Amino acid sequence: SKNVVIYADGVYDMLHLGHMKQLEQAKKLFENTTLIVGVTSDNETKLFKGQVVQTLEERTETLKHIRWVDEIISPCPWVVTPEFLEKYKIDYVAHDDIYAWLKRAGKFKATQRTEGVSTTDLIVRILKNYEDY
Amino acid sequence: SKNVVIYADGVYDMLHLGHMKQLEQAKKLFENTTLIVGVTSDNETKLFKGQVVQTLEERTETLKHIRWVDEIISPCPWVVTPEFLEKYKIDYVAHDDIYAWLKRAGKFKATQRTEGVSTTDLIVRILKNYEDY
Ligand SMILES: NCc1ccncc1
Ligand SMILES: NCc1ccncc1
Ligand SMILES: NCc1ccncc1
Ligand SMILES: NCc1ccncc1
């Protein structure tokens, strides 16, 4: 009934079906939702997580095309804070214990990952068309 | 004002930003539109055009996530006929002379391609992180 504001974040490098189904699942947590999507910066992703193929600007321009995405914060903060939830009027964080405070506040919503659909999995399928010998 | 029905078709293998921007451009040809997207079958694509990484079912499930896509015909016919336009009440075909009859009927609408954003271009960018020697 009342509109519920959902927040999900990530790298979204080389956007594939796995990200899409995750975002859809976040978007449909409730009947009436606004899904805000946060895109991690190149520097912090590279320092804290690992290598990223596409720049922040490219990764954001691709997310803009996904039907479930209502709003994008680019770049997003690397750590979600309670002050971040308050300023953007976020009701729930959708993710796939650093996150214990979100669970304690009733604001953690799980979303599953789909294995086997990644961009790299597809390139693996390309290479398997070449018998080793 | 009046709702205009747009049709675009293609393989949409390994969906990337290039396809997305093309679909957006088709969707925004007019103020009020319904964008129908046709997805070529595996057999006909492989026989007439060339190799396709993802099956028809996978290529369609990914397009379903694109915000501009209103309706999908999967599989679509390989050749667009006037009887196809009539049955689906298509007003315009958006594409990037086999298509001379569409131009003659006022139903051909061009959409441009974006070079440099393909899935394969990104894998090229990955491989360039490895100095040859
Ligand atoms: N992709 C992991 C991550 C998500 C949110 N903030 C930082 C890192
Ligand atoms: N669309 C947000 C953005 C714009 C320019 N650079 C990076 C991100
Ligand atoms: N991708 C080329 C094509 C588009 C429509 N029908 C057949 C082939
Ligand atoms: N979504 C249409 C479709 C379903 C099953 N196989 C291929 C295409």
PDB file of C-alpha atoms and ligand atoms in Angstrom:
ATOM      1  CA  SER A   1       0.000   0.000   0.000  1.00  0.00           C
ATOM      2  CA  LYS A   2       2.356   2.720   1.272  1.00  0.00           C
ATOM      3  CA  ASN A   3       5.370   3.192  -0.977  1.00  0.00           C
ATOM      4  CA  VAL A   4       8.489   1.479   0.407  1.00  0.00           C
ATOM      5  CA  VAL A   5      11.992   2.668  -0.477  1.00  0.00           C
ATOM      6  CA  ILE A   6      14.479  -0.151  -1.162  1.00  0.00           C
ATOM      7  CA  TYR A   7      18.242   0.237  -1.458  1.00  0.00           C
ATOM      8  CA  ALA A   8      20.691  -2.184  -3.082  1.00  0.00           C
ATOM      9  CA  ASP A   9      24.344  -1.570  -3.876  1.00  0.00           C
ATOM     10  CA  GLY A  10      27.160  -3.291  -5.691  1.00  0.00           C
ATOM     11  CA  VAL A  11      29.800  -3.022  -8.355  1.00  0.00           C
ATOM     12  CA  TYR A  12      27.559  -4.078 -11.291  1.00  0.00           C
ATOM     13  CA  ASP A  13      30.649  -4.649 -13.422  1.00  0.00           C
ATOM     14  CA  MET A  14      29.768  -6.200 -16.806  1.00  0.00           C
ATOM     15  CA  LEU A  15      26.057  -6.256 -16.002  1.00  0.00           C
ATOM     16  CA  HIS A  16      24.533  -9.704 -16.580  1.00  0.00           C
ATOM     17  CA  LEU A  17      21.309 -11.630 -15.913  1.00  0.00           C
ATOM     18  CA  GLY A  18      22.455 -12.410 -12.374  1.00  0.00           C
ATOM     19  CA  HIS A  19      22.463  -8.717 -11.413  1.00  0.00           C
ATOM     20  CA  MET A  20      19.162  -8.201 -13.249  1.00  0.00           C
ATOM     21  CA  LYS A  21      17.336 -10.969 -11.385  1.00  0.00           C
ATOM     22  CA  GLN A  22      18.756  -9.677  -8.090  1.00  0.00           C
ATOM     23  CA  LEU A  23      17.525  -6.147  -8.810  1.00  0.00           C
ATOM     24  CA  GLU A  24      14.120  -7.493  -9.864  1.00  0.00           C
ATOM     25  CA  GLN A  25      13.902  -9.440  -6.623  1.00  0.00           C
ATOM     26  CA  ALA A  26      14.733  -6.313  -4.624  1.00  0.00           C
ATOM     27  CA  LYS A  27      12.211  -4.259  -6.618  1.00  0.00           C
ATOM     28  CA  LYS A  28       9.438  -6.788  -5.836  1.00  0.00           C
ATOM     29  CA  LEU A  29      10.063  -7.183  -2.116  1.00  0.00           C
ATOM     30  CA  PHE A  30       6.771  -5.288  -1.621  1.00  0.00           C
ATOM     31  CA  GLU A  31       3.732  -4.275  -3.640  1.00  0.00           C
ATOM     32  CA  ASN A  32       4.683  -0.598  -3.964  1.00  0.00           C
ATOM     33  CA  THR A  33       8.423   0.179  -3.975  1.00  0.00           C
ATOM     34  CA  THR A  34      11.067   2.660  -5.053  1.00  0.00           C
ATOM     35  CA  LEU A  35      14.318   0.801  -5.770  1.00  0.00           C
ATOM     36  CA  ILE A  36      17.438   2.937  -5.285  1.00  0.00           C
ATOM     37  CA  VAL A  37      20.632   1.385  -6.647  1.00  0.00           C
ATOM     38  CA  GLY A  38      24.092   2.364  -5.403  1.00  0.00           C
ATOM     39  CA  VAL A  39      27.156   1.920  -7.599  1.00  0.00           C
ATOM     40  CA  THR A  40      30.535   1.617  -5.918  1.00  0.00           C
ATOM     41  CA  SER A  41      33.322   3.947  -7.004  1.00  0.00           C
ATOM     42  CA  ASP A  42      36.285   2.718  -9.026  1.00  0.00           C
ATOM     43  CA  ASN A  43      38.853   3.619  -6.367  1.00  0.00           C
ATOM     44  CA  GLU A  44      37.110   1.983  -3.406  1.00  0.00           C
ATOM     45  CA  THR A  45      36.112  -1.102  -5.399  1.00  0.00           C
ATOM     46  CA  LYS A  46      39.700  -1.554  -6.600  1.00  0.00           C
ATOM     47  CA  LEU A  47      41.148  -0.995  -3.125  1.00  0.00           C
ATOM     48  CA  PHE A  48      38.703  -3.085  -1.066  1.00  0.00           C
ATOM     49  CA  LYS A  49      37.258  -5.760  -3.391  1.00  0.00           C
ATOM     50  CA  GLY A  50      39.231  -6.212  -6.596  1.00  0.00           C
ATOM     51  CA  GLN A  51      39.529  -5.521 -10.279  1.00  0.00           C
ATOM     52  CA  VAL A  52      36.718  -3.781 -12.138  1.00  0.00           C
ATOM     53  CA  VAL A  53      36.522  -3.736 -15.927  1.00  0.00           C
ATOM     54  CA  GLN A  54      34.194  -0.780 -16.459  1.00  0.00           C
ATOM     55  CA  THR A  55      34.435   2.730 -15.056  1.00  0.00           C
ATOM     56  CA  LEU A  56      31.831   4.098 -12.692  1.00  0.00           C
ATOM     57  CA  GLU A  57      30.333   6.132 -15.515  1.00  0.00           C
ATOM     58  CA  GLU A  58      29.970   3.079 -17.787  1.00  0.00           C
ATOM     59  CA  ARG A  59      28.573   0.831 -15.046  1.00  0.00           C
ATOM     60  CA  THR A  60      25.964   3.466 -14.181  1.00  0.00           C
ATOM     61  CA  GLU A  61      24.870   4.172 -17.766  1.00  0.00           C
ATOM     62  CA  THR A  62      24.130   0.466 -18.205  1.00  0.00           C
ATOM     63  CA  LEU A  63      22.024   0.206 -15.007  1.00  0.00           C
ATOM     64  CA  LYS A  64      19.881   3.114 -16.229  1.00  0.00           C
ATOM     65  CA  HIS A  65      18.422   0.699 -18.812  1.00  0.00           C
ATOM     66  CA  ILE A  66      17.185  -1.878 -16.279  1.00  0.00           C
ATOM     67  CA  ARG A  67      13.419  -1.741 -15.843  1.00  0.00           C
ATOM     68  CA  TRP A  68      13.509  -2.302 -12.079  1.00  0.00           C
ATOM     69  CA  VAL A  69      15.835   0.617 -11.313  1.00  0.00           C
ATOM     70  CA  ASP A  70      14.031   3.720 -10.084  1.00  0.00           C
ATOM     71  CA  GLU A  71      16.952   5.831  -8.803  1.00  0.00           C
ATOM     72  CA  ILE A  72      20.728   5.513  -8.907  1.00  0.00           C
ATOM     73  CA  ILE A  73      23.313   6.893  -6.460  1.00  0.00           C
ATOM     74  CA  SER A  74      26.620   6.964  -8.348  1.00  0.00           C
ATOM     75  CA  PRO A  75      29.034   6.767  -6.660  1.00  0.00           C
ATOM     76  CA  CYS A  76      27.489   5.256  -3.533  1.00  0.00           C
ATOM     77  CA  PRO A  77      29.235   5.056  -0.148  1.00  0.00           C
ATOM     78  CA  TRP A  78      31.253   1.907   0.401  1.00  0.00           C
ATOM     79  CA  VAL A  79      29.797   1.377   3.900  1.00  0.00           C
ATOM     80  CA  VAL A  80      26.078   1.950   4.417  1.00  0.00           C
ATOM     81  CA  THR A  81      25.486   4.088   7.534  1.00  0.00           C
ATOM     82  CA  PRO A  82      22.275   4.863   9.466  1.00  0.00           C
ATOM     83  CA  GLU A  83      22.792   8.512   8.434  1.00  0.00           C
ATOM     84  CA  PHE A  84      22.774   7.382   4.804  1.00  0.00           C
ATOM     85  CA  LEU A  85      19.429   5.608   5.277  1.00  0.00           C
ATOM     86  CA  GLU A  86      17.962   8.694   6.937  1.00  0.00           C
ATOM     87  CA  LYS A  87      19.122  11.194   4.316  1.00  0.00           C
ATOM     88  CA  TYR A  88      17.745   9.181   1.366  1.00  0.00           C
ATOM     89  CA  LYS A  89      14.661   7.996   3.292  1.00  0.00           C
ATOM     90  CA  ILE A  90      15.591   4.355   2.712  1.00  0.00           C
ATOM     91  CA  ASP A  91      13.308   1.822   4.392  1.00  0.00           C
ATOM     92  CA  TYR A  92      15.091  -1.451   3.562  1.00  0.00           C
ATOM     93  CA  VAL A  93      18.488  -2.613   2.331  1.00  0.00           C
ATOM     94  CA  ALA A  94      18.416  -5.581  -0.040  1.00  0.00           C
ATOM     95  CA  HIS A  95      21.605  -7.680  -0.105  1.00  0.00           C
ATOM     96  CA  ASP A  96      22.661 -11.235  -0.960  1.00  0.00           C
ATOM     97  CA  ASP A  97      28.535  -9.697  10.700  1.00  0.00           C
ATOM     98  CA  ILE A  98      29.005  -6.273   9.067  1.00  0.00           C
ATOM     99  CA  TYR A  99      25.277  -6.169   8.291  1.00  0.00           C
ATOM    100  CA  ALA A 100      24.114  -7.086  11.820  1.00  0.00           C
ATOM    101  CA  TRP A 101      22.877  -3.560  12.538  1.00  0.00           C
ATOM    102  CA  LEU A 102      20.607  -3.744   9.492  1.00  0.00           C
ATOM    103  CA  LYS A 103      19.141  -7.049  10.635  1.00  0.00           C
ATOM    104  CA  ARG A 104      18.651  -5.613  14.142  1.00  0.00           C
ATOM    105  CA  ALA A 105      16.769  -2.626  12.698  1.00  0.00           C
ATOM    106  CA  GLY A 106      14.422  -4.774  10.597  1.00  0.00           C
ATOM    107  CA  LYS A 107      15.899  -3.331   7.392  1.00  0.00           C
ATOM    108  CA  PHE A 108      17.870  -6.304   5.975  1.00  0.00           C
ATOM    109  CA  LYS A 109      16.188  -8.103   3.054  1.00  0.00           C
ATOM    110  CA  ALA A 110      17.934 -11.035   1.407  1.00  0.00           C
ATOM    111  CA  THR A 111      18.090 -11.541  -2.367  1.00  0.00           C
ATOM    112  CA  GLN A 112      19.652 -14.587  -3.987  1.00  0.00           C
ATOM    113  CA  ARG A 113      22.322 -14.859  -6.651  1.00  0.00           C
ATOM    114  CA  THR A 114      22.019 -16.865  -9.859  1.00  0.00           C
ATOM    115  CA  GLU A 115      25.156 -18.833 -10.651  1.00  0.00           C
ATOM    116  CA  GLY A 116      26.050 -19.674 -14.237  1.00  0.00           C
ATOM    117  CA  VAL A 117      24.785 -16.547 -16.047  1.00  0.00           C
ATOM    118  CA  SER A 118      27.721 -14.182 -15.582  1.00  0.00           C
ATOM    119  CA  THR A 119      29.464 -12.377 -18.410  1.00  0.00           C
ATOM    120  CA  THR A 120      32.573 -14.476 -17.750  1.00  0.00           C
ATOM    121  CA  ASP A 121      30.575 -17.720 -17.830  1.00  0.00           C
ATOM    122  CA  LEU A 122      29.467 -16.773 -21.343  1.00  0.00           C
ATOM    123  CA  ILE A 123      33.037 -16.190 -22.505  1.00  0.00           C
ATOM    124  CA  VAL A 124      33.832 -19.603 -21.022  1.00  0.00           C
ATOM    125  CA  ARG A 125      31.057 -21.016 -23.223  1.00  0.00           C
ATOM    126  CA  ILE A 126      32.664 -19.320 -26.239  1.00  0.00           C
ATOM    127  CA  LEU A 127      36.071 -20.832 -25.508  1.00  0.00           C
ATOM    128  CA  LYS A 128      34.623 -24.323 -25.048  1.00  0.00           C
ATOM    129  CA  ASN A 129      33.919 -24.380 -28.827  1.00  0.00           C
ATOM    130  CA  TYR A 130      37.640 -25.083 -29.259  1.00  0.00           C
ATOM    131  CA  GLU A 131      38.547 -28.685 -28.512  1.00  0.00           C
ATOM    132  CA  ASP A 132      41.851 -28.669 -26.646  1.00  0.00           C
ATOM    133  CA  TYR A 133      43.598 -30.788 -29.299  1.00  0.00           C
TER     134      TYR A 133
ATOM    135  CA  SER B   1      -0.654  11.652 -28.784  1.00  0.00           C
ATOM    136  CA  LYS B   2      -2.046   8.430 -30.281  1.00  0.00           C
ATOM    137  CA  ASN B   3      -0.095   5.367 -29.193  1.00  0.00           C
ATOM    138  CA  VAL B   4       2.346   4.181 -31.878  1.00  0.00           C
ATOM    139  CA  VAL B   5       3.500   0.562 -32.083  1.00  0.00           C
ATOM    140  CA  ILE B   6       7.220   0.142 -32.850  1.00  0.00           C
ATOM    141  CA  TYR B   7       8.929  -3.100 -33.834  1.00  0.00           C
ATOM    142  CA  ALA B   8      12.648  -3.896 -33.653  1.00  0.00           C
ATOM    143  CA  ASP B   9      14.298  -7.276 -34.099  1.00  0.00           C
ATOM    144  CA  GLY B  10      17.720  -8.809 -33.743  1.00  0.00           C
ATOM    145  CA  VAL B  11      19.787 -11.533 -32.180  1.00  0.00           C
ATOM    146  CA  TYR B  12      20.516  -9.688 -28.891  1.00  0.00           C
ATOM    147  CA  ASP B  13      23.283 -12.174 -28.130  1.00  0.00           C
ATOM    148  CA  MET B  14      25.250 -11.189 -25.000  1.00  0.00           C
ATOM    149  CA  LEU B  15      23.127  -8.090 -24.439  1.00  0.00           C
ATOM    150  CA  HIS B  16      25.269  -4.964 -24.006  1.00  0.00           C
ATOM    151  CA  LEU B  17      24.912  -1.170 -23.835  1.00  0.00           C
ATOM    152  CA  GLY B  18      24.859  -0.961 -27.630  1.00  0.00           C
ATOM    153  CA  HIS B  19      21.621  -2.967 -27.835  1.00  0.00           C
ATOM    154  CA  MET B  20      20.187  -1.015 -24.892  1.00  0.00           C
ATOM    155  CA  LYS B  21      20.781   2.397 -26.467  1.00  0.00           C
ATOM    156  CA  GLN B  22      19.323   1.124 -29.753  1.00  0.00           C
ATOM    157  CA  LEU B  23      16.177  -0.122 -28.010  1.00  0.00           C
ATOM    158  CA  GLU B  24      15.880   3.155 -26.090  1.00  0.00           C
ATOM    159  CA  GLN B  25      16.157   5.071 -29.345  1.00  0.00           C
ATOM    160  CA  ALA B  26      13.415   2.941 -30.897  1.00  0.00           C
ATOM    161  CA  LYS B  27      11.224   3.346 -27.800  1.00  0.00           C
ATOM    162  CA  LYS B  28      11.529   7.161 -28.005  1.00  0.00           C
ATOM    163  CA  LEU B  29      10.846   7.587 -31.711  1.00  0.00           C
ATOM    164  CA  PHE B  30       7.511   9.149 -30.656  1.00  0.00           C
ATOM    165  CA  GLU B  31       5.884  10.570 -27.546  1.00  0.00           C
ATOM    166  CA  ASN B  32       3.589   7.594 -26.908  1.00  0.00           C
ATOM    167  CA  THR B  33       4.880   4.193 -28.073  1.00  0.00           C
ATOM    168  CA  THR B  34       4.651   0.452 -27.561  1.00  0.00           C
ATOM    169  CA  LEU B  35       8.015  -1.140 -28.391  1.00  0.00           C
ATOM    170  CA  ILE B  36       7.748  -4.764 -29.542  1.00  0.00           C
ATOM    171  CA  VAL B  37      11.068  -6.610 -29.704  1.00  0.00           C
ATOM    172  CA  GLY B  38      11.615  -9.680 -31.885  1.00  0.00           C
ATOM    173  CA  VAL B  39      14.293 -12.230 -31.032  1.00  0.00           C
ATOM    174  CA  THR B  40      15.653 -14.400 -33.823  1.00  0.00           C
ATOM    175  CA  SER B  41      15.618 -18.165 -33.379  1.00  0.00           C
ATOM    176  CA  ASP B  42      18.801 -20.142 -32.795  1.00  0.00           C
ATOM    177  CA  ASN B  43      18.458 -22.204 -35.975  1.00  0.00           C
ATOM    178  CA  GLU B  44      17.816 -19.324 -38.378  1.00  0.00           C
ATOM    179  CA  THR B  45      20.438 -17.085 -36.765  1.00  0.00           C
ATOM    180  CA  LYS B  46      23.037 -19.861 -37.011  1.00  0.00           C
ATOM    181  CA  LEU B  47      22.107 -20.690 -40.607  1.00  0.00           C
ATOM    182  CA  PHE B  48      21.784 -17.156 -42.019  1.00  0.00           C
ATOM    183  CA  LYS B  49      23.974 -14.870 -39.868  1.00  0.00           C
ATOM    184  CA  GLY B  50      26.460 -16.745 -37.706  1.00  0.00           C
ATOM    185  CA  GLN B  51      27.366 -18.063 -34.305  1.00  0.00           C
ATOM    186  CA  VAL B  52      25.227 -17.221 -31.288  1.00  0.00           C
ATOM    187  CA  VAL B  53      26.429 -17.791 -27.734  1.00  0.00           C
ATOM    188  CA  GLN B  54      23.110 -17.802 -25.882  1.00  0.00           C
ATOM    189  CA  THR B  55      19.979 -19.803 -26.609  1.00  0.00           C
ATOM    190  CA  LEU B  56      16.748 -18.129 -27.607  1.00  0.00           C
ATOM    191  CA  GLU B  57      15.384 -18.669 -24.115  1.00  0.00           C
ATOM    192  CA  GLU B  58      18.402 -17.001 -22.464  1.00  0.00           C
ATOM    193  CA  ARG B  59      18.494 -14.072 -24.900  1.00  0.00           C
ATOM    194  CA  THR B  60      14.794 -13.416 -24.289  1.00  0.00           C
ATOM    195  CA  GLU B  61      14.947 -13.632 -20.484  1.00  0.00           C
ATOM    196  CA  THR B  62      17.641 -10.945 -20.502  1.00  0.00           C
ATOM    197  CA  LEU B  63      15.649  -8.547 -22.741  1.00  0.00           C
ATOM    198  CA  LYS B  64      12.706  -8.802 -20.330  1.00  0.00           C
ATOM    199  CA  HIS B  65      14.776  -6.705 -17.890  1.00  0.00           C
ATOM    200  CA  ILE B  66      15.281  -3.746 -20.252  1.00  0.00           C
ATOM    201  CA  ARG B  67      13.109  -0.786 -19.299  1.00  0.00           C
ATOM    202  CA  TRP B  68      12.268   0.167 -22.887  1.00  0.00           C
ATOM    203  CA  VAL B  69      10.883  -3.243 -23.873  1.00  0.00           C
ATOM    204  CA  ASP B  70       7.094  -3.429 -23.794  1.00  0.00           C
ATOM    205  CA  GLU B  71       6.465  -6.736 -25.611  1.00  0.00           C
ATOM    206  CA  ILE B  72       8.668  -9.536 -26.906  1.00  0.00           C
ATOM    207  CA  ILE B  73       8.031 -11.933 -29.808  1.00  0.00           C
ATOM    208  CA  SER B  74      10.319 -14.922 -29.229  1.00  0.00           C
ATOM    209  CA  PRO B  75      11.104 -16.393 -31.665  1.00  0.00           C
ATOM    210  CA  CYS B  76      10.405 -13.713 -34.267  1.00  0.00           C
ATOM    211  CA  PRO B  77      10.255 -14.345 -38.025  1.00  0.00           C
ATOM    212  CA  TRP B  78      13.561 -13.973 -39.820  1.00  0.00           C
ATOM    213  CA  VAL B  79      12.005 -11.872 -42.614  1.00  0.00           C
ATOM    214  CA  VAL B  80       9.486  -9.191 -41.672  1.00  0.00           C
ATOM    215  CA  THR B  81       6.405  -9.413 -43.930  1.00  0.00           C
ATOM    216  CA  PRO B  82       3.486  -6.990 -44.428  1.00  0.00           C
ATOM    217  CA  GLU B  83       1.243  -9.739 -42.992  1.00  0.00           C
ATOM    218  CA  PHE B  84       3.402  -9.726 -39.864  1.00  0.00           C
ATOM    219  CA  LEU B  85       2.933  -5.963 -39.444  1.00  0.00           C
ATOM    220  CA  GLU B  86      -0.823  -6.324 -39.883  1.00  0.00           C
ATOM    221  CA  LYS B  87      -1.276  -9.192 -37.427  1.00  0.00           C
ATOM    222  CA  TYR B  88       0.648  -7.465 -34.605  1.00  0.00           C
ATOM    223  CA  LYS B  89      -0.664  -3.987 -35.502  1.00  0.00           C
ATOM    224  CA  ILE B  90       2.876  -2.677 -35.968  1.00  0.00           C
ATOM    225  CA  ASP B  91       3.117   0.921 -37.171  1.00  0.00           C
ATOM    226  CA  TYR B  92       6.887   1.297 -37.639  1.00  0.00           C
ATOM    227  CA  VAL B  93       9.959  -0.915 -37.922  1.00  0.00           C
ATOM    228  CA  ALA B  94      13.092   0.456 -36.267  1.00  0.00           C
ATOM    229  CA  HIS B  95      16.383  -0.826 -37.718  1.00  0.00           C
ATOM    230  CA  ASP B  96      20.016   0.284 -37.959  1.00  0.00           C
ATOM    231  CA  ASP B  97      17.676  -3.097 -50.445  1.00  0.00           C
ATOM    232  CA  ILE B  98      15.798  -5.787 -48.483  1.00  0.00           C
ATOM    233  CA  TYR B  99      14.098  -3.060 -46.437  1.00  0.00           C
ATOM    234  CA  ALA B 100      12.984  -0.956 -49.434  1.00  0.00           C
ATOM    235  CA  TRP B 101       9.331  -1.930 -49.008  1.00  0.00           C
ATOM    236  CA  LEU B 102       9.398  -0.597 -45.447  1.00  0.00           C
ATOM    237  CA  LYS B 103      10.850   2.715 -46.587  1.00  0.00           C
ATOM    238  CA  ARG B 104       8.236   2.899 -49.368  1.00  0.00           C
ATOM    239  CA  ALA B 105       5.441   2.351 -46.829  1.00  0.00           C
ATOM    240  CA  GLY B 106       6.681   5.077 -44.470  1.00  0.00           C
ATOM    241  CA  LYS B 107       7.425   2.475 -41.784  1.00  0.00           C
ATOM    242  CA  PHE B 108      11.262   2.418 -41.726  1.00  0.00           C
ATOM    243  CA  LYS B 109      12.854   4.265 -38.784  1.00  0.00           C
ATOM    244  CA  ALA B 110      16.625   4.319 -38.427  1.00  0.00           C
ATOM    245  CA  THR B 111      18.433   3.800 -35.112  1.00  0.00           C
ATOM    246  CA  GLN B 112      22.192   4.071 -34.737  1.00  0.00           C
ATOM    247  CA  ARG B 113      24.700   1.641 -33.284  1.00  0.00           C
ATOM    248  CA  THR B 114      27.254   2.472 -30.603  1.00  0.00           C
ATOM    249  CA  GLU B 115      30.673   1.022 -31.344  1.00  0.00           C
ATOM    250  CA  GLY B 116      33.052   0.155 -28.524  1.00  0.00           C
ATOM    251  CA  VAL B 117      30.589  -1.027 -25.842  1.00  0.00           C
ATOM    252  CA  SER B 118      30.056  -4.646 -26.869  1.00  0.00           C
ATOM    253  CA  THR B 119      30.517  -7.601 -24.557  1.00  0.00           C
ATOM    254  CA  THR B 120      33.513  -8.687 -26.644  1.00  0.00           C
ATOM    255  CA  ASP B 121      35.078  -5.217 -26.463  1.00  0.00           C
ATOM    256  CA  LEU B 122      35.010  -5.550 -22.675  1.00  0.00           C
ATOM    257  CA  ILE B 123      36.772  -8.914 -22.761  1.00  0.00           C
ATOM    258  CA  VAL B 124      39.336  -7.254 -25.029  1.00  0.00           C
ATOM    259  CA  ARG B 125      39.816  -4.643 -22.291  1.00  0.00           C
ATOM    260  CA  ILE B 126      40.360  -7.462 -19.778  1.00  0.00           C
ATOM    261  CA  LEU B 127      43.020  -9.115 -21.929  1.00  0.00           C
ATOM    262  CA  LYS B 128      44.869  -5.832 -22.482  1.00  0.00           C
ATOM    263  CA  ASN B 129      45.889  -5.940 -18.777  1.00  0.00           C
ATOM    264  CA  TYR B 130      48.481  -8.531 -19.822  1.00  0.00           C
ATOM    265  CA  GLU B 131      51.511  -6.982 -21.489  1.00  0.00           C
ATOM    266  CA  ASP B 132      52.517  -9.247 -24.363  1.00  0.00           C
ATOM    267  CA  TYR B 133      56.005  -9.858 -22.935  1.00  0.00           C
TER     268      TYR B 133
HETATM  269  N1  LIG C   1      29.948  -5.413  -4.031  1.00  0.00           N
HETATM  270  C1  LIG C   1      30.231  -5.370  -2.614  1.00  0.00           C
HETATM  271  C2  LIG C   1      29.917  -4.053  -1.942  1.00  0.00           C
HETATM  272  C3  LIG C   1      28.616  -3.604  -1.793  1.00  0.00           C
HETATM  273  C4  LIG C   1      28.409  -2.373  -1.158  1.00  0.00           C
HETATM  274  N2  LIG C   1      29.359  -1.571  -0.692  1.00  0.00           N
HETATM  275  C5  LIG C   1      30.614  -2.020  -0.845  1.00  0.00           C
HETATM  276  C6  LIG C   1      30.944  -3.246  -1.458  1.00  0.00           C
HETATM  277  N1  LIG C   2      25.869   9.135 -13.948  1.00  0.00           N
HETATM  278  C1  LIG C   2      26.692   9.450 -12.789  1.00  0.00           C
HETATM  279  C2  LIG C   2      28.107   9.643 -13.157  1.00  0.00           C
HETATM  280  C3  LIG C   2      28.445  10.656 -14.063  1.00  0.00           C
HETATM  281  C4  LIG C   2      29.794  10.807 -14.426  1.00  0.00           C
HETATM  282  N2  LIG C   2      30.780  10.010 -13.956  1.00  0.00           N
HETATM  283  C5  LIG C   2      30.431   9.028 -13.091  1.00  0.00           C
HETATM  284  C6  LIG C   2      29.106   8.806 -12.668  1.00  0.00           C
HETATM  285  N1  LIG C   3      20.217  -9.445 -36.639  1.00  0.00           N
HETATM  286  C1  LIG C   3      19.828  -9.432 -38.031  1.00  0.00           C
HETATM  287  C2  LIG C   3      18.396  -9.839 -38.295  1.00  0.00           C
HETATM  288  C3  LIG C   3      17.330  -9.052 -37.891  1.00  0.00           C
HETATM  289  C4  LIG C   3      16.034  -9.499 -38.174  1.00  0.00           C
HETATM  290  N2  LIG C   3      15.721 -10.634 -38.789  1.00  0.00           N
HETATM  291  C5  LIG C   3      16.765 -11.384 -39.174  1.00  0.00           C
HETATM  292  C6  LIG C   3      18.112 -11.033 -38.953  1.00  0.00           C
HETATM  293  N1  LIG C   4      10.205 -16.642 -23.427  1.00  0.00           N
HETATM  294  C1  LIG C   4       9.967 -17.262 -24.722  1.00  0.00           C
HETATM  295  C2  LIG C   4      10.662 -18.556 -24.848  1.00  0.00           C
HETATM  296  C3  LIG C   4      10.357 -19.586 -23.949  1.00  0.00           C
HETATM  297  C4  LIG C   4      11.050 -20.802 -24.065  1.00  0.00           C
HETATM  298  N2  LIG C   4      12.012 -21.021 -24.990  1.00  0.00           N
HETATM  299  C5  LIG C   4      12.302 -20.009 -25.841  1.00  0.00           C
HETATM  300  C6  LIG C   4      11.655 -18.758 -25.803  1.00  0.00           C
END
